């Protein structure tokens, strides 16, 4: 029809691997405020950053502990 990559979620922009999981927690930073639940090596749910980052670098995203 008219499909296009309009990133309405400014700041959450990784379109590799997979989609999302709605109401989950991040296999790294336990954030639950995430609209883009990607998978890690185990197929474990990760928020935009930890999935975006691992996709670039094959590793989790140095950020916080595990719960901030
Ligand atoms: Zn995360």
Q: Which domain holds residue 41?
A: 1-68
Instruction: Please give the C-alpha separations between residue 6 and each of 11, 33, 38, 48, in angstroms, as whole numbers.
Output: 12, 20, 19, 16
- 6 CA to middle of ligand 1, Å? 23
The count of domains in the chain is 1
- 10 CA to middle of ligand 1, Å? 16
Residues in the chain: 68
Could you tell me which residues come within 8 angstroms of residue 64 by beta carbon, excluding any fewer than 6 positions away?
Answer: 29
Ligand 1 ion: residues within 5 Å (CB): 26, 28-29, 47, 50
- 47 CA to middle of ligand 1, Å? 4
Q: Check: CB of residue 61 under 8 Å from CB of residue 51.
A: no
Q: How far apart are the first and last CA of the chain?
A: 42
Strands 45-46 and 38-39: antiparallel
How many CB atoms neighbour CB 24 within 10 A?
15
Preceding residues of all breaks in the chain (C to N beyond 2.5 angstroms)? none
Tell me the three state secondary structure of residue 38. strand
């Amino acid at each position: 029809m008219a499909h296009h990559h309009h990133h309405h979620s400014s700041g959450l922009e990784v379109l590799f691997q997979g989609p999302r999981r709605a109401g989950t927690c991040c296999a790294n930073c336990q954030t639950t405020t995430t609209t883009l639940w990607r998978r890690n090596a185990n197929g474990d749910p990760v928020c935009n950053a930890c999935g975006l980052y691992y996709k670039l670098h094959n590793v989790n995203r140095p950020l916080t502990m595990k719960k901030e």
